[PDB]
Amino acid sequence: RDPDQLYSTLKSILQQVKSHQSAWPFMEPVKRTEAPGYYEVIRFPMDLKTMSERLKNRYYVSKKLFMADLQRVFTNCKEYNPPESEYYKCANILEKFFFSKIKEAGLID
Numbered sequence: 392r393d394p395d396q397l398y399s400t401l402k403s404i405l406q407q408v409k410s411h412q413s414a415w416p417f418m419e420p421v422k423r424t425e426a427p428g429y430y431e432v433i434r435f436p437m438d439l440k441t442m443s444e445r446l447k448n449r450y451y452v453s454k455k456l457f458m459a460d461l462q463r464v465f466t467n468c469k470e471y472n473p474p475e476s477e478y479y480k481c482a483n484i485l486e487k488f489f490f491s492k493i494k495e496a497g498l499i500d
């Protein structure tokens with residue numbers, strides 16, 4: 392299936408991202424109790440557990456929807472955290488990895 396080809400490609404990419412050594416900050420939703428005013432600043436929170444659910448739920452009917460969510464994970468983090476924080480470092484490392492995988496899968500060419 393053309394839908395099911397997409398699904399496989401996205402699942403492979405998301406799995407690789409989740410397995411990456413720098414994915415650990417992004418594995419679950421930011422906790423309100425740990426991040427003061429995070430949910431006042433960041434309007435569209437996202438994390439890799441929520442993306443896994445969305446994927447299983449057949450939400451990612453296009454590459455664009457998938458890339459927007461995953462990009463939001465990094466840019467939320469970079470907006471909120473200090474530039475030399477461990478979280479910011481992880482976000483940019485993982486983002487580099489993400490762009491290399493989407494290129495390699497021909498999701499952008």
Ligand SMILES: Cc1nn(CCO)c2c1C(=O)CCC2
Binds near residue numbers: 416467472
């Ligand atoms: C703020 C903030 N605090 N925590 C830890 C609590 O969830 C995290 C953040 C992020 O911005 C992304 C990584 C995880």
